[PDB]
Amino acid sequence: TNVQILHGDLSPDLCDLARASELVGWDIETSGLDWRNGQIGTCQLAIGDSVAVVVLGDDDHPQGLCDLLADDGVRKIFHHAPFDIRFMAQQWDCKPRNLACTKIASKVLNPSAEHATHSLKPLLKATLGVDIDKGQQQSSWTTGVLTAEQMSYAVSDVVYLSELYSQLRAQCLDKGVLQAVENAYSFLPVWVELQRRGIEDVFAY
Amino acid sequence: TNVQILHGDLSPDLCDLARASELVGWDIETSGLDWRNGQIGTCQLAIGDSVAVVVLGDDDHPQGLCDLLADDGVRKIFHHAPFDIRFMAQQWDCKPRNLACTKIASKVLNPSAEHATHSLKPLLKATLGVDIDKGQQQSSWTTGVLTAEQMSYAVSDVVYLSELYSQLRAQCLDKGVLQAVENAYSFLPVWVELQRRGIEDVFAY
């Protein structure tokens, strides 16, 4: 894994590589859970054998990252895409396209499992035998400065997503639920627009 | 409008006509809002120029209606499909396919409107200039007996759905949101399976 640290936006070279990539792993770190009035601190992208950690500041509107997020020709893989894409769509006024989610896949595969088993850490252990440390999850991500410990945590949160997705995708195919999962993925851009306009669940009364 | 009253299941002639129809309007009446342990009292279907009201009894498992609901080659139009398909999927152990919803279309078109405007009665008035009377909505639908007033209400709840859908579909095309609406429709079979297995919102944490 080739780790790069950036600020303000993704580099043009990595934007180009992302457009040619099969899959782009994506995660964010934030001020908290407040997608409306909070702040994105980092974007971490896994592009090929590279992981890029982009440190963001107050009122950053990264054009390269938003163009990538909005590009329907680039497949983005998240763990719990709803959280990340809602934060980015609202904070950047960005329309995300071509989105996939390992947590949604886990839930469609095993809907009656205990809720905790769908979290990234247990899911990585159960699916790939990979152990990650979530200790820095609740650190302060929005100061424009990263510690080495934060960098390690940020890389670990994104670097396994493409492999996790590929394994979960295979499990969905084996069970005959991949089309169902893909129908959930195709609704994600609609879901987040509804969120921004105040419809919290279009399927509720 | 040619109205027919049936019991137990849809007639074979109407099942055949439904398979050749562009659209099939569908509504149900029930014991209440309890889709898990309640009871379906009627199914009302709009097939061509016909409306069929099928009166159902305790523990009815209508094979013809479930086959139609599960047939991906038959386009069903509901108003608030989530309510109806969840009731039918749970009560009949049926897998619904190829579903559309005038309420979801209304919400994607006008997500910031007052919630009441998405109800069938105001939506029919605003879109088609049609007035319906909802007085019999909260009657007792599960006794195996229908009054003439209940029959009139049941017909009115389904007979305008194909026209309402066509008008809303045109509005979605004009605004450029039809693909978004169709992505919501394609998630409905996944949504209801998740509901039955206890995932109330796969997009929540």
Give the domain ranges of chain B: 2-197
In whole angstroms, give the CA distance from residue A54 to residue B26: 51
Q: Decide: helix, strand or coil at residue B154.
A: helix
Q: Is B17 on the interface with A (CB under 8 A)?
A: no
In whole angstroms, give the CA distance from residue A86 to residue A82: 6
Residue with tokens 């719990």, as numbered in its chain: A80
Closest Cβ–Cβ partner in A82, A187, A197 for B187: A187
- Cβ-Cβ contacts under 8 Å for B150 (sequence gap 6 or more): B29, B136, B139, B141
Q: Is B104 on the interface with A (CB under 8 A)?
A: yes
Contact indicator for B27, B78 with CB cutoff of 8 Å: yes
Tell me if A183 and B190 make a contact (CB, 8 A cut-off). yes
Residue A81 CA, chain-centre distance (Å), reads 5
Q: Which of B69, B50, B49 is nearest to B9 (CA)?
A: B69
Q: Taking CA B177 as the corner, what is the angle to CA B172 and CA B179, rounded to the nearest 5 degrees?
A: 105
Cα–Cα distances (Å) from B155 to B25, B48, B80, in that order, read 11, 13, 16
Q: B6 - beta bridge partners? A: B54
Closest Cβ–Cβ partner in B112, B184, B199 for A107: B199
Q: Which residues in chain B are contacts of A205 at CB distance < 8 A? A: 80, 82-83
**CATH architecture label of A2-197:** 2-Layer Sandwich (3.30)
Instruction: For residue B26, give how far its alpha carbon lies from the nearest alpha carbon of chain A (Å).
Output: 17
Please tell me what DSSP assigns to residue B135: T
Q: Among B98, B172, B187, B201, which would you mutate to test the A interface (most chain A Cβ atoms within 10 Å of its Cβ)? A: B187
In whole angstroms, give the CA distance from residue A47 to residue B170: 41
Instruction: For residue A30, give how far its alpha carbon lies from the nearest alpha carbon of chain B (Å).
Output: 16
Closest Cβ–Cβ partner in A190, A199, A201 for B183: A190
Rg for chain A (alpha carbons), in Å? 16
**CB contact burial B182-205 (16+ within 10 A = b; e otherwise):** bbbbbbbbbbbbbbbeebebbbee
Q: Which of B169, B185, B162, B166 is nearest to B46 (CA)?
A: B162
Neighbours of A174 (CB within 10 A): 10
Q: Is A189 on the interface with B (CB under 8 A)?
A: yes
- Resolution for this model in angstroms, one decimal place? 1.5
Please tell me what DSSP assigns to residue B152: H
Q: Is B203 on the interface with A (CB under 8 A)?
A: yes
Name residue A48's amino acid.
G
Instruction: For residue A73, give how far its alpha carbon lies from the nearest alpha carbon of chain B (Å).
Output: 17
Contact indicator for B29, B83 with CB cutoff of 8 Å: no
Q: B81 - beta bridge partners? A: none
Q: Is B78 on the interface with A (CB under 8 A)?
A: no
Which stretches of B51-147 are DSSP H helices? Answer: 63-70, 81-92, 102-109, 120-128
Q: Is A180 on the interface with B (CB under 8 A)?
A: yes
- Segment (H or E) for B45: strand B40-47
DSSP for chain A reads -EEEEEESS--HHHHHHHHT-S-EEEEEEESSS-TTT--EEEEEEEETTEEEEEE--TT---HHHHHHHH-TTS-EEESSHHHHHHHHHHHHT----SEEEHHHHHHHHSTTS-GGGGSHHHHHHHHH------TTTTS---SS---HHHHHHHHHHHHTHHHHHHHHHHHHHHHT-HHHHHHHHHHHHHHHHHHHHT-S-TT--
DSSP for B109-128 reads HSTTS-GGGGSHHHHHHHHH
Q: Which residues in chain B are contacts of A197 at CB distance < 8 A? A: 111-112
